[PDB]
């Protein structure tokens, strides 16, 4: 679990844009690198969506060191003012450990 090289860091890699319609049950598959196996007394993964209106906490599954997925859920924002809203997402495990997001990958709620 020692990181000495910058390329070996826990980070989320981008895919072609994350499209999310409001009020539709969807899974959100992610790719990444060197995702840790949670150890003794350590919980699993969650996706946290930073929507000013409503912030959603959805638990996820780490399939291997290189892929994640938040589970079937629907999302919304209260306004009807902007069609395309990009949202900061943070991928957490064991409650508060936020994985690094270099490209600052966002979820588009349309």
């Amino acid at each position: 679990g020692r990181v000495n090289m910058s390329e070996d860091c826990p980070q989320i890699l981008p895919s072609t844009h994350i499209y999310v319609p409001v009020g539709v049950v969807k899974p959100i598959t992610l790719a990444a690198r060197n995702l840790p196996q949670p150890q003794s007394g350590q919980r699993g993964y969650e996706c946290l969506f930073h929507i000013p209106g409503s912030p959603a906490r959805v638990t996820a599954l780490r399939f291997n060191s290189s892929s994640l997925q938040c589970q079937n859920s629907s999302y919304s924002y209260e306004g009807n003012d902007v069609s395309d809203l990009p949202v900061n997402l943070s991928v957490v495990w064991n409650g508060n450990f936020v994985i690094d997001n270099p490209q600052n990958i966002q979820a588009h709620l349309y």
Binding site: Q37, Q39, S40, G41, G44, T59, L61, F63, N64, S65, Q71, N72
Partner: protein, 654 residues
């Protein structure tokens, strides 16, 4: 001495296993999996437990949402298997539809825990030990490591297979784990419970007790339900087998197994243990060196698998004899005779297809006459029967030929049995019994000898206990040493201790080590009785069953004095102590003092052989009656009115 022990601080224990290289002991428990040293010190503790979950939920909450309410439940270690090849431990739990864990061998680091796919789920069943299996491997690049594993199903016929042949990839993170060896839309390397058989008999289920790899196969001792024995539940204990190289699963065989003792039926397996017999039992059971044997434990009748009877019997099966019963049964169905006869699997009875074949022990099954059952129930050779305290577990081993058997009890006791049916004796005799959790914590099936085979780790609900196979040093005397009979023990004459052949220095030499009670040190002194008034008396010593003492010997009357002796013929000549030395002893004890005259060997410097030696005092008698009509040679002087050994010390003649 004290028994080395590991206590279960909070929860119950379920499984134990020993690493053949290190002697590290791994211990499966509810919510915990421990690594322990050879002497049972805690080395590492893994939390596997209390998980928020629900048994009714398919794929567990991690993968899909379940409408059933969740609660913090306990995760029971169902299984534990050492994968030496991939430097790890397969630590299969429950309470997640039975997801399996991989812990690294030397530190318990979770390498992987696959739970996305449906194969990564093993069974809902929350019961400990109702599961078993074996790990089998080939070299990297070749046909990879496989796991054969049986489990109960709880009626979830379509979710899980009871018996399966599954893949073990080198990457624990690899998704391919616990996938079947060969999957087809027609036939997969698995065996499911048919839905029709669950509709007919409501809660039929297969509970897997023990399992082992032998030569090229894989056996399982199982418990099943009433299917030709809706009503009530009555169980039938059976043997199962497969070829290791049979992806199609056509080799499946299933014979009922038990044994009878004076018209009393024993049909419920509690444990088993595959072993060797060593030169002794092998010869008079008629076997070749590498021929295997199966010790077992059965309870009386076919009632209450959940809580069996006290009445229990340790039986025996030679694998050559079970191999012949299976070969005999197959060369029979390939004569076209009768049906396959396997109730729970095939509800409508398909018939035996005749065909010309070379029926061998190498036969791995064919397309037609398929998976098949057994008619003639295989009877075992009984050995020992407990009636007041139920046997629970068993192990065995080869020691210098003689075959030692270990037997757990409901009380928390271990029996150390020499099996002597093939040996000279009338029937196999108990040698010794020992205590672990005396209060009445039962011993569990997982009972493993160490790698050096010096100890035997004995597990309870609540504690692991290092019970030595050999601990002859508890024996104080040649007469008790060789009297216990537990075959590791001999009297190392010159060291005056009881222990094994390899532990007694120079044992190989003549008379230095005693193995039959008749070899015991036996000693005699010619002048048994010597008066206090005498000094430096010559005594002759006859001793038999003693090694060459040309090394030198001293006589020590006790830890008081020590006189040098010289050797002639088959006799030892030494002297009594001086009057100056003798009286310091006899002062206080009056009439006489019986004293244990030892021999102290020059080579060892330890007292080994003893005799009753009497120091008598005449003078202290103060009356004629005490003097003469006592027990000793003493003379009374009428006139001086004194008692003495010398006639001349008397007043005068008359």
């Amino acid at each position: 001495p004290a028994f080395r022990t590991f206590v279960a601080s909070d929860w119950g224990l379920t499984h134990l296993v020993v690493h053949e290289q290190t002697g590290e002991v791994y211990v499966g428990a509810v919510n915990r999996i421990y690594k322990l040293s050879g002497n049972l010190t805690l080395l590492r503790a893994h939390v596997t437990g209390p998980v928020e979950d629900n048994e009714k939920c398919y794929p567990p909450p991690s993968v899909q949402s379940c409408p059933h309410g969740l609660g913090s439940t306990d995760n029971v270690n169902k299984l534990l298997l050492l994968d030496y090849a991939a430097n790890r431990l397969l630590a299969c739990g429950s309470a997640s539809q039975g997801i399996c864990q991989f812990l690294r061998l030397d530190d318990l680091f979770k390498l992987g825990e696959p739970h996305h796919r449906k194969e990564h789920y093993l069974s809902s069943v929350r019961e400990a030990g109702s599961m078993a299996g074996v790990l089998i491997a080939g070299p990297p690049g070749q046909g990879q490591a496989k796991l054969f594993v049986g489990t109960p199903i709880d009626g979830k016929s379509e979710y899980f297979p009871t018996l399966s042949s599954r893949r073990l990839m080198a990457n624990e993170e690899d998704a391919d784990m616990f996938g079947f060896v060969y999957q087809d839309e027609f036939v997969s390397s698995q065996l499911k419970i048919p839905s029709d058989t669950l509709s007919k008999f409501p809660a039929f289920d297969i509970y897997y007790v023990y399992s082992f790899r032998s030569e090229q196969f894989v056996y399982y001792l199982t418990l099943q339900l009433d299917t030709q024995l809706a009503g009530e539940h009555f169980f039938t204990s059976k043997i199962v087998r497969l070829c290791v190289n049979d992806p199609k699963f056509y080799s499946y065989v299933e014979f009922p197994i038990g044994c009878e003792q004076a018209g009393v039926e024993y049909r419920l397996v509690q444990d088993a243990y595959l072993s060797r017999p060593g030169q002794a039992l092998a010869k008079q059971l008629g076997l070749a060196e590498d021929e295997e044997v199966l010790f077992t434990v059965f309870a009386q009748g076919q009632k209450n698998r959940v809580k069996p009877p006290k009445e229990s019997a340790l039986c025996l099966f030679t694998l050559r004899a079970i191999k012949e019963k299976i070969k005999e049964r197959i060369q029979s169905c390939y004569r076209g005779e009768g049906k396959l006869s396997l109730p729970w699997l095939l509800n409508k009875e398909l018939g035996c297809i005749n065909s010309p074949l070379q029926i061998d022990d190498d036969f791995c099954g064919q397309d037609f006459n398929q998976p098949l059952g057994g008619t003639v129930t295989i009877e075992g050779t009984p050995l020992f029967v407990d009636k007041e305290d139920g046997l629970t577990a068993v192990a065995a081993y080869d020691y210098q030929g003689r075959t030692v058997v270990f037997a757990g009890t409901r009380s928390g006791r271990i029996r150390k049995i020499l099996v002597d049916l093939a040996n000279p004796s009338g029937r196999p005799a108990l040698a010794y019994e020992s205590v672990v959790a005396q209060e009445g914590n039962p011993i569990l099936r997982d009972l493993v000898l160490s790698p050096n085979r010096q100890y035997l780790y004995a597990m309870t609900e609540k504690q692991v206990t290092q019970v030595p196979v050999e601990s002859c040093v508890q024996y104080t005397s040649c007469e008790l040493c060789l009297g216990s009979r537990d075959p590791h023990c001999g009297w190392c004459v010159l060291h005056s201790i009881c222990s094994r052949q390899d532990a007694c220095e120079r044992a190989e030499e003549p008379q230095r080590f005693a193995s039959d009670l008749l070899q015991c040190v036996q000693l005699t002194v010619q002048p048994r009785n010597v008066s206090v008034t005498m000094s430096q008396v010559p005594l002759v010593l006859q001793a038999w069953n003693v090694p060459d003492l040309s090394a030198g010997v001293n006589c020590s009357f006790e830890d008081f004095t020590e006189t040098e002796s010289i050797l002639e013929d088959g006799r030892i000549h030494c002297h009594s102590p001086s009057a100056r030395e003798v009286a310091p002893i006899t002062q206080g004890q009056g009439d006489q003092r019986v004293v244990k005259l030892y021999l102290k060997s020059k080579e060892t410097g330890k007292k080994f052989a003893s005799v009753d030696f009497v120091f008598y005092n005449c003078s202290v008698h103060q009356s004629c009656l005490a003097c003469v009509n006592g027990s000793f040679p003493c003379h009374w002087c009428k006139y001086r009115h004194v008692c003495t050994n010398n006639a001349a010390d008397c007043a005068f003649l008359e």
